[PDB]
Design a protein around this motif. Structure first.
Motif, mmCIF file in Angstrom:
data_model
loop_
_atom_site.group_PDB
_atom_site.id
_atom_site.type_symbol
_atom_site.label_atom_id
_atom_site.label_comp_id
_atom_site.label_asym_id
_atom_site.label_seq_id
_atom_site.Cartn_x
_atom_site.Cartn_y
_atom_site.Cartn_z
ATOM 1 N N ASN A 103 0.837 -1.188 0.000
ATOM 2 C CA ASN A 103 0.000 0.000 0.000
ATOM 3 C C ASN A 103 0.877 1.245 0.000
ATOM 4 O OD1 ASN A 103 -2.193 1.691 0.109
ATOM 5 N ND2 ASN A 103 -2.656 1.307 2.272
ATOM 6 N N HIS A 104 0.455 2.255 -0.762
ATOM 7 C CA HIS A 104 1.169 3.527 -0.873
ATOM 8 C C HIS A 104 2.591 3.323 -1.404
ATOM 9 C CE1 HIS A 104 -2.092 4.622 1.980
ATOM 10 N NE2 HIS A 104 -2.046 5.776 1.338
ATOM 11 N N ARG A 105 2.669 2.781 -2.618
ATOM 12 C CA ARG A 105 3.942 2.574 -3.295
ATOM 13 C C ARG A 105 4.332 3.752 -4.180
ATOM 14 N NH1 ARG A 105 5.008 -3.597 -4.699
ATOM 15 N NH2 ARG A 105 5.934 -3.575 -2.606
ATOM 16 N N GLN A 106 3.476 4.762 -4.297
ATOM 17 C CA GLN A 106 3.794 5.925 -5.113
ATOM 18 C C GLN A 106 4.900 6.745 -4.459
ATOM 19 O OE1 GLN A 106 1.426 9.676 -7.286
ATOM 20 N NE2 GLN A 106 0.378 8.298 -5.857
ATOM 21 N N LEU A 107 5.890 7.141 -5.256
ATOM 22 C CA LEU A 107 7.044 7.877 -4.760
ATOM 23 C C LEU A 107 7.372 9.021 -5.711
ATOM 24 C CD1 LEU A 107 9.715 6.890 -6.619
ATOM 25 C CD2 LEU A 107 9.354 4.809 -5.297
ATOM 26 N N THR A 108 8.003 10.059 -5.169
ATOM 27 C CA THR A 108 8.243 11.306 -5.881
ATOM 28 C C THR A 108 9.643 11.343 -6.486
ATOM 29 O OG1 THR A 108 8.313 13.716 -5.659
ATOM 30 C CG2 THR A 108 8.989 12.404 -3.761
ATOM 31 N N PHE A 109 9.850 12.325 -7.371
ATOM 32 C CA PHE A 109 11.140 12.479 -8.037
ATOM 33 C C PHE A 109 12.232 12.906 -7.061
ATOM 34 C CE2 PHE A 109 10.294 13.068 -12.860
ATOM 35 C CZ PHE A 109 9.620 11.866 -12.875
ATOM 36 N N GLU A 110 11.919 13.833 -6.152
ATOM 37 C CA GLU A 110 12.940 14.350 -5.248
ATOM 38 C C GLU A 110 13.495 13.264 -4.337
ATOM 39 O OE1 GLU A 110 14.032 17.303 -5.624
ATOM 40 O OE2 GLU A 110 15.333 17.616 -3.887
ATOM 41 N N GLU A 111 12.667 12.288 -3.965
ATOM 42 C CA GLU A 111 13.153 11.173 -3.160
ATOM 43 C C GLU A 111 14.227 10.392 -3.907
ATOM 44 O OE1 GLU A 111 10.168 9.525 -0.757
ATOM 45 O OE2 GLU A 111 11.010 7.499 -0.716
ATOM 46 N N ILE A 112 13.980 10.096 -5.186
ATOM 47 C CA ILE A 112 14.982 9.417 -6.003
ATOM 48 C C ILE A 112 16.226 10.280 -6.142
ATOM 49 C CG2 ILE A 112 15.383 8.206 -8.164
ATOM 50 C CD1 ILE A 112 12.359 8.163 -8.571
ATOM 51 N N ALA A 113 16.035 11.585 -6.344
ATOM 52 C CA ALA A 113 17.171 12.483 -6.521
ATOM 53 C C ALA A 113 18.063 12.495 -5.287
ATOM 54 C CB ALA A 113 16.679 13.892 -6.842
ATOM 55 N N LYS A 114 17.458 12.500 -4.098
ATOM 56 C CA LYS A 114 18.249 12.509 -2.872
ATOM 57 C C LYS A 114 18.895 11.153 -2.613
ATOM 58 C CE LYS A 114 16.133 14.143 0.603
ATOM 59 N NZ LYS A 114 16.725 15.495 0.405
ATOM 60 N N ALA B 278 19.724 8.679 -4.837
ATOM 61 C CA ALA B 278 20.726 8.335 -5.836
ATOM 62 C C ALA B 278 21.785 9.415 -6.012
ATOM 63 C CB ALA B 278 20.053 8.050 -7.181
ATOM 64 N N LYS B 279 21.658 10.540 -5.307
ATOM 65 C CA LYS B 279 22.643 11.624 -5.342
ATOM 66 C C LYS B 279 22.836 12.168 -6.756
ATOM 67 C CE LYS B 279 25.166 10.089 -1.249
ATOM 68 N NZ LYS B 279 24.771 11.239 -0.392
ATOM 69 N N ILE B 280 21.727 12.368 -7.468
ATOM 70 C CA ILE B 280 21.728 13.025 -8.769
ATOM 71 C C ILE B 280 20.582 14.026 -8.802
ATOM 72 C CG2 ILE B 280 22.667 10.958 -9.872
ATOM 73 C CD1 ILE B 280 20.027 10.325 -10.986
ATOM 74 N N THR B 281 20.662 14.960 -9.744
ATOM 75 C CA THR B 281 19.596 15.933 -9.899
ATOM 76 C C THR B 281 18.434 15.333 -10.690
ATOM 77 O OG1 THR B 281 19.050 18.157 -10.679
ATOM 78 C CG2 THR B 281 20.685 16.912 -11.936
ATOM 79 N N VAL B 282 17.342 16.096 -10.767
ATOM 80 C CA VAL B 282 16.070 15.545 -11.229
ATOM 81 C C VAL B 282 16.126 15.187 -12.711
ATOM 82 C CG1 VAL B 282 14.601 16.529 -9.445
ATOM 83 C CG2 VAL B 282 15.299 17.931 -11.389
ATOM 84 N N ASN B 283 16.846 15.976 -13.510
ATOM 85 C CA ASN B 283 16.708 15.913 -14.962
ATOM 86 C C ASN B 283 17.047 14.546 -15.546
ATOM 87 O OD1 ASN B 283 16.144 18.785 -15.013
ATOM 88 N ND2 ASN B 283 18.347 19.090 -14.713
ATOM 89 N N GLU B 284 17.790 13.709 -14.821
ATOM 90 C CA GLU B 284 18.154 12.392 -15.328
ATOM 91 C C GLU B 284 17.254 11.273 -14.828
ATOM 92 O OE1 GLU B 284 19.717 14.756 -13.891
ATOM 93 O OE2 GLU B 284 21.894 14.468 -13.865
ATOM 94 N N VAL B 285 16.494 11.502 -13.753
ATOM 95 C CA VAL B 285 15.837 10.392 -13.063
ATOM 96 C C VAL B 285 14.923 9.631 -14.015
ATOM 97 C CG1 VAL B 285 16.022 11.701 -10.928
ATOM 98 C CG2 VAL B 285 13.862 11.714 -12.183
ATOM 99 N N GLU B 286 14.221 10.348 -14.900
ATOM 100 C CA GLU B 286 13.349 9.687 -15.865
ATOM 101 C C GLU B 286 14.114 8.619 -16.629
ATOM 102 O OE1 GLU B 286 11.670 12.624 -18.396
ATOM 103 O OE2 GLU B 286 11.191 14.028 -16.777
ATOM 104 N N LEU B 287 15.244 9.008 -17.228
ATOM 105 C CA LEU B 287 16.057 8.054 -17.971
ATOM 106 C C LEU B 287 16.401 6.854 -17.108
ATOM 107 C CD1 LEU B 287 18.488 10.517 -19.803
ATOM 108 C CD2 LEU B 287 16.234 9.698 -20.511
ATOM 109 N N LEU B 288 16.783 7.098 -15.850
ATOM 110 C CA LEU B 288 17.092 5.993 -14.952
ATOM 111 C C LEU B 288 15.935 5.011 -14.898
ATOM 112 C CD1 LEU B 288 19.374 8.041 -13.951
ATOM 113 C CD2 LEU B 288 19.093 6.891 -11.741
#
Lengths: 286, 49, 94, 116
Positions: free
Chosen positions: C5-16, C18-28
């Protein structure tokens, strides 16, 4: 390779009376025989079978004895009466599969490259089918062996032929279904399903209890399948699912409403007809 | 208006500071359960007769 | 890590994480979807990811007890429904 | 007047009785009416001025407004009051029907296929 196997009641009766006549003599545990049947596409059919002298020792699971000449001459003898039948596999009446099964399967794979093992329970106590079907295969994994012989299950069912059907219908005089309708559509389908699901969950409970306290041979494929099972449960609290469910139920109830109305009208018509036709019978007697 | 709102006659709300009454609009009764009951009653009747 | 339950997650969480900025996360995530490691779908205008299925893994002997307890209070619902359906519709046939 | 929501006439006539004192019962009616008006204001409002309650409820400024709000808790000051309502409990759940509707369908089947 194989998709479904169909079993006639004749082989079941033969298994039962073979077990009775050979177990009356002494305290044997397992008996073995060979099946006859036919192929079509990927569907296998079993017609009849005959027994064979077999011996096995309880001291060790590496000593056992079968007869070759008996099997050969008996197959040759059944050839002269019906040439359509052919050797397909073997059966053993053990309650559960044993260690020697692989060795016997290898032994009599000579007469049929696609031998199929069948297990028949002689004293069932539940509503499940008495027959189970297995086929050999080679499995491969990371380390330990390039290939290993392993059994895999195949779907089985009980079929019937016209003469066999009339025979079993004549034999089953006492027991017959009460009604055919919502009754047989409900109890024979739903409650039995709940029974089977509960039994399966209890068995997997037992295996999981055996681990992390007792023997503990941690196996990983079972764990992977358990994760897959526990991940596939749907969610019924979602708003869209509830709305769709309500829409479909409301759509469905109108038809029952209409049918009930029609039944009431027909009943009133029948009552009118009977009353009118019968009120004109008392005056004929004078 | 308040007394009518309290017993569930209407689903509107009033702003004392402003004065106007803002009615609440919510329509989709086919997704509601109630048609099921509205059919259950007649079905039972037709089964009894 | 997250529950079913509640598996939805935001971009900023991934950015923090994985220690990268937002613009690449989609590609990841795109790559994570290409090689079939994880199955799901991704939104862009709201900066959200809807994660659905992840590969299984091995785990120790003190974690399977959770699955055992889940089966424990799963079997009881089936038993209760069995009893309720059996009792409610008795006279339809004894 | 009491059956519907009209309340001003009640307190207006409470100071006008041609029969006799009748003061033993008008006080009880006043207490009950004030309590039910307090109950009603709790619903359908998320904002109201402090003096508006003093206008609606006939105690003007006797310091009884703060003790009265102690009786009916309220939340905030700044000459304002707030209330919160959910009301989504009944919706968004199909499990609650799942048993009663199964019973209803079982009843339909039972009274549909029994010989009378």
């Amino acid at each position: 390779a194989v998709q479904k196997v169909v079993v006639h009641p004749l082989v079941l009766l033969s298994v039962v009376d073979h077990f009775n006549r050979i177990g009356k003599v002494g305290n044997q545990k397992r008996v073995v025989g060979v099946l006859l049947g036919s192929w079509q596409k990927k569907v296998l059919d079993v017609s009849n079978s005959f027994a064979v002298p077999f011996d096995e020792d309880d001291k060790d699971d590496s000593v056992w004895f079968l007869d070759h000449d008996y099997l050969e001459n008996m197959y040759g003898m059944f050839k002269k009466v019906n040439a359509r039948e052919r050797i397909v596999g073997w059966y053993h009446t053990g309650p559960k599969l044993h260690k020697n099964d692989i060795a016997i399967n290898e032994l009599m794979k000579r007469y049929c490259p696609n031998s199929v093992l069948v297990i028949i329970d002689v004293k069932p106590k539940d509503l499940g089918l008495p027959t189970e079907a297995y086929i050999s295969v080679e499995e491969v994994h990371d380390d330990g062996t390039p290939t290993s012989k392993t059994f895999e299950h195949v779907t089985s069912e009980i079929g019937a032929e016209e003469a066999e059907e009339v025979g079993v219908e004549h034999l089953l005089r006492d027991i017959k279904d009460t009604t055919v309708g919502t009754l047989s559509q409900r109890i024979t389908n739903q409650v039995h399903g709940l029974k089977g699901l509960n039994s399966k969950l209890l068995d997997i409970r037992s295996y999981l209890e055996k681990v992390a306290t007792g023997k503990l041979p941690i196996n990983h494929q079972i764990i992977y399948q358990l994760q897959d099972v526990f991940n596939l449960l749907p969610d019924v609290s979602l708003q869209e699912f509830v709305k769709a469910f309500y829409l479909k139920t409301n759509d469905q109830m109108v038809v029952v409403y209409l049918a009930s109305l029609i039944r009431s009208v027909v009943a009133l018509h029948n009552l009118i007809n009977n009353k009118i036709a019968n009120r004109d019978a008392e005056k004929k007697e004078g | 208006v308040a007394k009518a709102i309290r017993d569930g006659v209407i689903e509107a709300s009033i702003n004392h500071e402003k004065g106007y009454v803002q009615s609440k609009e919510m329509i989709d009764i086919y997704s509601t359960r109630e048609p099921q009951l509205a059919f259950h009653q007649r079905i039972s009747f037709c089964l009894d007769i | 890590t997250r529950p079913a339950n509640h598996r939805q997650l935001t971009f900023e969480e991934i950015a923090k994480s994985a220690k990268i900025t937002v613009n690449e996360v989609e590609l990841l995530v795109m790559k994570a979807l290409s090689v079939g490691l994880v199955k799901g779908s991704i939104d862009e205008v709201d900066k959200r990811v809807h994660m659905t299925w992840v590969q299984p893994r091995v785990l120790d002997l003190q974690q399977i007890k959770g699955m055992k307890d889940r089966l424990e209070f799963w079997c009881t619902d089936v038993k209760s429904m069995e009893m309720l359906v059996e009792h409610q519709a008795h006279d339809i046939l004894t | 007047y009491l059956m519907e929501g009209s309340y001003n006439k009640v307190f207006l006539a409470k100071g006008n009785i041609p029969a006799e004192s009748y003061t033993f019962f008008i006080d009880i009616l006043l207490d009950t009416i004030r309590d039910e008006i307090a109950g009603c204001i709790e619903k359908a409002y998320e904002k109201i001025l402090f003096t508006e309650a003093t206008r609606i409820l006939f105690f003007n400024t006797p310091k009884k407004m703060t003790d009265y709000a102690k009786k009916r808790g309220w939340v905030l000051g700044p000459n304002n009051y707030y209330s919160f309502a959910s009301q989504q409990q009944k919706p968004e759940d199909t499990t609650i029907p799942s048993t009663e509707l199964a019973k209803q369908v079982i009843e339909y089947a039972r009274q549909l296929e029994m010989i009378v």
